Amino acid sequence: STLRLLISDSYDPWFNLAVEECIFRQMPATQRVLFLWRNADTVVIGRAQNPWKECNTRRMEEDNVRLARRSSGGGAVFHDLGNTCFTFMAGKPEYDKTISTSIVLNALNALGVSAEASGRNDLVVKTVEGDRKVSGSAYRETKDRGFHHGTLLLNADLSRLANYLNPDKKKLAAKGITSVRSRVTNLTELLPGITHEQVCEAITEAFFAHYGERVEAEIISPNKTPDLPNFAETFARQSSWEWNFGQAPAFSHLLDERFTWGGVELHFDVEKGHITRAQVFTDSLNPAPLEALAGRLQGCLYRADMLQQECEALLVDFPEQEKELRELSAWMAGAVR
Amino acid sequence: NVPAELKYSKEHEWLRKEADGTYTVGITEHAQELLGDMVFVDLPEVGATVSAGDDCAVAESVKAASDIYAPVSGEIVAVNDALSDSPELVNSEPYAGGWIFKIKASDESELESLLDATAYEALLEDE
Numbered sequence: 246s247t248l249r250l251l252i253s254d255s256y257d258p259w260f261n262l263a264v265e266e267c268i269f270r271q272m273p274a275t276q277r278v279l280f281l282w283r284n285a286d287t288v289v290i291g292r293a294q295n296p297w298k299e300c301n302t303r304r305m306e307e308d309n310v311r312l313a314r315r316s317s318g319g320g321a322v323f324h325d326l327g328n329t330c331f332t333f334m335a336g337k338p339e340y341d342k343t344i345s346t347s348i349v350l351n352a353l354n355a356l357g358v359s360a361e362a363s364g365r366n367d368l369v370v371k372t373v374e375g376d377r378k379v380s381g382s383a384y385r386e387t388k389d390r391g392f393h394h395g396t397l398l399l400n401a402d403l404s405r406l407a408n409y410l411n412p413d414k415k416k417l418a419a420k421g422i423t424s425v426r427s428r429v430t431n432l433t434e435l436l437p438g439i440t441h442e443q444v445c446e447a448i449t450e451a452f453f454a455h456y457g458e459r460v461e462a463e464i465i466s467p468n469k470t471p472d473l474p475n476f477a478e479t480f481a482r483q484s485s486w487e488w489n490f491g492q493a494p495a496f497s498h499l500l501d502e503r504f505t506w507g508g509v510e511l512h513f514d515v516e517k518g519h520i521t522r523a524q525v526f527t528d529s530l531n532p533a534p535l536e537a538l539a540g541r542l543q544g545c546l547y548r549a550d551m552l553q554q555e556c557e558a559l560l561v562d563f564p565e566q567e568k569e570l571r572e573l574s575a576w577m578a579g580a581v582r
Numbered sequence: 583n584v585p586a587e588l589k590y591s592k593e594h595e596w597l598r599k600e601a602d603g604t605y606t607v608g609i610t611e612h613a614q615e616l617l618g619d620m621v622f623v624d625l626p627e628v629g630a631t632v633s634a635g636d637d638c639a640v641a642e643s644v645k646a647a648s649d650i651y652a653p654v655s656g657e658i659v660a661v662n663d664a665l666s667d668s669p670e671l672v673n674s675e676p677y678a679g680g681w682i683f684k685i686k687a688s689d690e691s692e693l694e695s696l697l698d699a700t701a702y703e704a705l706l707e708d709e
C-alpha cells in the first residue's frame with residue numbers, strides 16, 4: 246500500500262498549491278502520489294515568470310481572476326473549472342516524468358481520446374484544421390523527490406483563457422522565463438459531455454493499473470485546514486503578493502503619458518518587487534516635484550497603492566501643483582496595474 | 583572528468599576553497615548533464631544566512647526546476663549574476679563561469695564530513 250490518492254475539493258489555487266508542496270515535502274521515501282485538483286478562474290505562472298509581462302494583470306484584477314506563482318518552472322497557463330490538474334509524485338531514483346506522461350495518455354485512450362506527447366511539455370491531438378494542444382506540464386525535482394503536474398483542457402472558457410494570457414502592451418525589459426504559445430482546444434470536441442470526475446476515474450484507473458494496486462481516495466476539504474504539517478505557513482506564503490508578484494526576476498518598466506501640462510516618462514528598475522531606482526524625463530515647465538519624486542520613489546513597492554501613497558506624500562511638499570500630481574498618481578496607478 | 587583538487591557532496595555540488603578564505607560553489611559536470619540546457623538560475627538572496635543541506639537556489643533547465651543545496655552552512659557572500667544573463671554557462675563551464683554563489687563557512691566541522699575527488703567517482707558508479 247505505497248500508492249496514495251489525494252483529491253482536492255477546493256478551487257483556491259493558493260490553497261491547492263500549498264497542499265501540493267506540503268504533501269510533496271513530507272512525502273514518505275517509497276510512495277507514489279497522485280493528486281487531482283482544479284482551480285476557479287486563475288492564472289498560474291512558473292517560478293521565474295514576470296506576471297505583468299506574461300498575463301493581463303489589469304484585466305485579471307478587474308474580474309478578480311486569481312494569480313498564483315508555482316514552485317515548478319514553465320510558462321503561464323489559465324485555469325477554470327473546465328481545466329483539470331494532475332500531479333504525479335514519486336521518490337528517486339524511481340521518479341520519471343515519462344512514466345506519468347504515458348499514464349495520462351493511457352487514461353485518455355481509455356476514454357477514447359488519442360493524444361501524442363509533443364516537445365518536452367505538451368500533449369496534443371489531431372484535428373481537421375491542424376494540431377491542437379490540450380495539455381501543459383511542468384516539473385520540479387529535488388535530491389530525493391520529484392513531481393510532474395500538468396493540465397487537461399476539458400471544457401474551459403478559451404476566450405477568457407486567450408484574454409488574460411494576452412497581456413497589455415507594456416514597455417518591459419525583464420529576465421525570467423517567457424511563455425511558449427501553442428494553439429489549444431478542449432477535449433470536448435473529441436469526447437462530448439466530458440466531465441472532470443470522468444477524467445479523474447481514467448487517470449486514477451491507469452495509475453492503479455501501472456503500479457498494480459489500489460487505495461481509497463482521500464478527500465481534502467476546502468472549508469477548513471488540512472492536518473498536513475507546516476501548512477498554514479506555506480499557504481500564507483503562497484497567498485502573499487511577495488511570492489505571487491514579488492518573486493519577479495529583475496526587470497525594468499518604461500511608462501509614459503501626455504498631460505495637458507506636459508509629457509512624462511518614467512523608468513523603473515525593479516528587483517524583488519521593489520523599485521530599486523526610478524528616473525523621470527519630462528518637458529514640463531515644473532520638474533521640481535517630479536525630479537523629487539524619482540528620488541523619493543526608491544525602495545517603493547511596485548504597486549498602485551504605494552505609488553499613490555508616495556504621490557500624496559508629495560503633494561504635502563509641492564502644493565502649487567496639487568492638480569497635476571493628482572493626474573500623475575491617477576495615471577501612474579493604472580499604468581502598473 | 584572530476585577536478586581532483588575540489589571537494590564534493592551528495593547533492594552533486596563542488597566546493598572551491600578560495601585563497602581569501604572564502605568559498606565558491608557550483609554544480610558538478612555530471613549534474614549539469616543530467617539536468618539539461620539551463621534557462622534560468624534562481625540565485626539566493628545576497629547576504630543571507632544559510633545552513634548545510636538547506637536549499638538555497640533553484641535551477642530551472644528545459645528539463646525541470648531542480649533543487650540546489652548549500653553543502654556548508656554560513657554567510658551568502660556573492661552571487662554570479664552573470665548567470666542571470668547566460669545560464670548556459672552552467673552547462674558549458676560547470677567549474678569555470680558556471681559558478682553559482684560564494685560563501686563563508688560559519689562552522690567548518692562540516693568539511694570534515696564530506697567527500698574528496700576520488701570519493702566522488704566511487705559515488706558516481708552507483709548514484
Ligand SMILES: CCCCCCCCOP(=O)(O)OC[C@H]1O[C@@H](n2cnc3c(N)ncnc32)[C@H](O)[C@@H]1O
Pocket residue numbers: 289315318319320321322323324328330366378379380381382383394395396397398406410423424425426427428429
Ligand atoms: C498546475 C499545472 C501547472 C502546469 C503549467 C504548464 C506550463 C505551461 O507553460 P508553456 O509555456 O509550456 O505553455 C504556455 C501556453 O500554454 C497554453 N495554455 C494556456 N493555458 C493552458 C492550459 N490550461 N492547458 C494547456 N495549455 C494552456 C497557452 O497557449 C500558453 O501560451
